[PDB]
Design a binder for these strands. Structure first.
Ligand SMILES: [Zn+2]
Ligand SMILES: [Zn+2]
Lengths: 71, 94, 177, 37, 146, 156
RNA sequence: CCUACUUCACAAAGCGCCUUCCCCCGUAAAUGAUAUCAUCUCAACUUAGUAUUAUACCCACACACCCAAGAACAGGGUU
């Protein structure tokens, strides 16, 4: 849904792209132990087990607790 | 206030109620909250887009993890659009 | 736009559920589509460390189609690790045993060979037939077009199309046929 | 069957047939003529 | 087309026979393929074209009867084999793994237990080399071996 | 020349027909006029611009910060016009140069906010078993610019 | 596995006893075209023709002492 148009001199391309709204008809009304724990978490979040095991103090201390923040 | 968000600066409670009040001031009926898009509804990481419709016309839609959160965020987006404090509004002139 | 920071981030990095129909499709083309989606290489916000993969639900994997004689020639090799544990099984035998293994292995081979591969395979959902569990069906968001367009059979062609196609030759009348 | 690099019909009833991927010379009269590529 | 009917007494009756469609695009050609400008523009899945040279039970028709070139008769025969093996002619039968582009009869190929090294890989044939000269609509040539 | 409808009779991609030049020019003029009227009436919020500065292209908007990896021979706080604007876009329209937009269309202005050195960068060379080890520390001059405003004019 | 025999003796053993269950494919055929016969078919098709190992086994989330359980740990029992 974009309108392309060179200008008369042909030196600049003009693109008209209005934002199209979602039609009302295209919408639905609003409705009104360590082992087993890690298996449950992996099933819940569609991950593997390895993510949920802890890490040693060395890794934990290596993690930066005051990371730079942008925007 | 550059880079700040409207409701990051102005803390509000019940944005849906506040939006309903504003629409009443504008003599407009209460918007219909309606589920425009959704993803993974039965999982632990759902995505919902809820749009507020004024007479079958979309005024603002917002995303969220639950339908309630998406509706609340859509209310916030509608308030931003009504007040002209949208993210892509004309930047301040200096 | 004009979302709050947290909802905006959630929307951008939310994972979508795609549906592939494996009926009469090459497992390799299915695997290319699925591997792209599982990695997240279909998102402009993709990055290997962003965990931006999506869910892929492939149905009718029992009805995949191999081109050529791959059903008889393609051999899947495995070793149990024990001496004499080397097993070589053709594609047809593997399909009869597990109606999911062929697509699963194609996708597994196409995914990058790193530690994210099995996490990606956790987001892959393979179903031999048209049946899909209700929660997965409710999760479904989009259906991807089938990579191979299924050719029509004569039994499927309409009489109008048959008439539209010209007769190519005059058969001699005095022929048994 | 005898394995032959080159298949040669021996009598008139020796016929070449490509079966199970390879060429054979079969013969009803003289099964001694049976050849396999 | 003559058909033999029994009752014992048997007799052959000539029935309705289709004729070539009017206005061939290229009249005065060797083969029907040349007459209709289809030299390199049909594939195994073009059942409408292929079935016109097929016995009611699936067999090919002889080159003398069809009038096809030698090369075109070979191409049609191989394309019909591929269409049959892909199941595109369910009604042209004498009386479950989906396939297509199968060069060999399924029961005659042996599994590739030892695919060679990279420089001597044993590849799985796909399609037919007879169609190598078909019209190429792709940047890369279509591969006959996988 | 007619070929019966087969799989290979026609190219797989859909056939494309060039629109008639008269209607193409009419539609082009209509779209250009609509966007020009939007510019006249100020029917746009934030503007972004792709600008070629130094050697690179920067996606830029008002209040943005840009780090040039060289000194610019400008005093801090000095205002500047970035003259090579390749693209300017709004919510509802974009203007594309071929390759550059005109000076009459867009005006992107920046301000030299900082003149600094980069953090020390290490260049080490090492070759095993050759007694070959060299170390150098380099700091690159840098200028931080702030994009103050992007202005467009109805000169389409 | 220990009822006998034997080495032996509150048990461990053999020299003693008990139990052990499905196939793989080379070919041989049927109909049948290309090539109106024929032709087992890297033609379509129909059989011998089977691995898609069938099973079987295991499955209880949460001191001390004894043990046919055992290096430790673990396991079983303590009504
Ligand atoms: Zn003989
Ligand atoms: Zn010809």
């Amino acid at each position: 849904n974009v309108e392309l148009a060179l200008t008369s001199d042909g030196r600049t391309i003009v693109c008209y792209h209005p934002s199209v709204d979602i039609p009302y008809e295209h919408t639905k009304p609003i409705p009104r132990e360590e082992g087993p724990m890690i298996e449950q978490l992996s099933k819940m979040f569609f991950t593997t087990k390895h993510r949920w095991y802890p890490h040693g103090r060395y890794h934990r201390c290596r993690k930066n607790l005051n990371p730079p923040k942008d925007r | 206030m550059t880079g700040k968000e409207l409701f990051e600066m102005w803390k509000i409670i019940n944005p849906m109620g506040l939006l309903v009040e504003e629409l009443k001031k504008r003599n407009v009926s209460a918007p219909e909250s309606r589920l425009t898009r959704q993803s993974g509804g039965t999982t632990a990481l759902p995505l919902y887009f809820v749009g507020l419709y004024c007479d079958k016309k979309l005024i603002a839609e917002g995303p969220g993890e639950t339908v309630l959160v998406a509706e609340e965020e859509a209310a916030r987006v509608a308030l931003r659009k009504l007040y002209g404090f949208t993210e892509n509004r004309r930047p301040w002139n200096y | 736009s004009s979302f709050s920071r947290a909802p905006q981030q959630w929307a951008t990095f939310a994972r979508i559920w795609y549906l592939l129909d494996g009926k009469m499709q090459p497992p390799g083309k299915l695997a290319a589509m699925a591997s792209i989606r599982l990695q997240g290489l279909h998102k402009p916000v993709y990055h290997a460390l962003s965990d931006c993969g999506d869910h892929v639900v492939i149905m009718n994997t029992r009805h995949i189609a191999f081109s050529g004689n791959k059903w008889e020639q393609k051999v899947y090799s495995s070793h149990t690790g024990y001496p004499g544990g080397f097993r070589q099984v053709t594609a047809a035998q593997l399909h009869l045993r597990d109606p999911v293994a062929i697509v699963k292995l194609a996708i597994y081979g196409m995914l990058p060979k790193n530690l994210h591969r099995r996490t990606m395979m956790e987001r892959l959902h393979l179903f031999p037939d048209e049946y899909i569990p209700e929660d997965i069906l409710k999760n479904l968001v989009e259906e991807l077009p089938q990579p191979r367009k299924i050719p029509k059979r004569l039994d499927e062609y309409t009489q109008e199309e048959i008439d539209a196609f010209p007769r190519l030759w005059t058969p001699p009348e005095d022929y048994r046929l | 069957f005898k394995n032959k690099t080159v298949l040669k019909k021996r009598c008139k009833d020796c016929y070449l047939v490509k079966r199970r991927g390879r060429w054979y010379v079969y013969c009803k009269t003289h099964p001694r003529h049976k050849q396999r590529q | 087309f003559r058909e033999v009917v029994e009752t014992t007494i048997i007799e052959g009756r000539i029935t309705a026979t289709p004729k070539e469609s009017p206005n061939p695009p290229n009249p005065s050609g060797q083969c029907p393929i040349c007459r209709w400008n289809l030299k390199h523009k049909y594939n195994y899945d073009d059942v409408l074209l292929l079935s016109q040279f097929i016995r009611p039970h699936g067999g090919m028709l002889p080159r003398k009867i069809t009038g096809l070139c030698q090369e075109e008769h070979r191409k049609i025969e191989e394309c019909v084999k591929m269409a049959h093996r892909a199941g595109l002619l369910p009604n042209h039968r004498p009386r479950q793994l989906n396939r297509y582009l199968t060069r060999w009869a399924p029961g005659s190929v042996k599994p590739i237990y030892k695919k060679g090294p990279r420089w001597n890989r044993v590849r799985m044939p796909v399609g037919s080399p007879l169609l190598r000269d078909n019209v190429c609509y792709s940047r890369t040539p279509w591969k006959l071996y996988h | 020349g007619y070929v019966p409808k087969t799989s290979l009779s026609s190219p797989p991609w859909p056939e494309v027909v060039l629109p008639d030049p008269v209607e193409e020019t009419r539609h082009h003029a209509e779209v250009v006029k609509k966007v020009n009227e939007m510019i006249v009436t100020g029917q746009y919020g934030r503007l972004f611009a792709v600008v070629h500065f130094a050697s690179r292209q920067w996606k830029v908007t008002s209040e943005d910060l840009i780090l040039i990896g060289n000194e610019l021979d400008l005093a801090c706080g000095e205002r500047i016009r970035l003259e090579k604007v390749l693209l300017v876009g709004a919510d509802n329209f974009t203007l594309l140069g071929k390759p550059l937009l005109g000076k009459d269309l867009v005006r992107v202005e920046a301000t030299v906010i900082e003149k600094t050195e980069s953090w020390p960068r290490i260049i080490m060379r090492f070759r095993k078993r050759k007694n070959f080890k060299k170390k150098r520390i380099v700091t690159t001059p840098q200028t931080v610019l702030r994009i103050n405003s992007i202005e467009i004019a109805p000169c389409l």
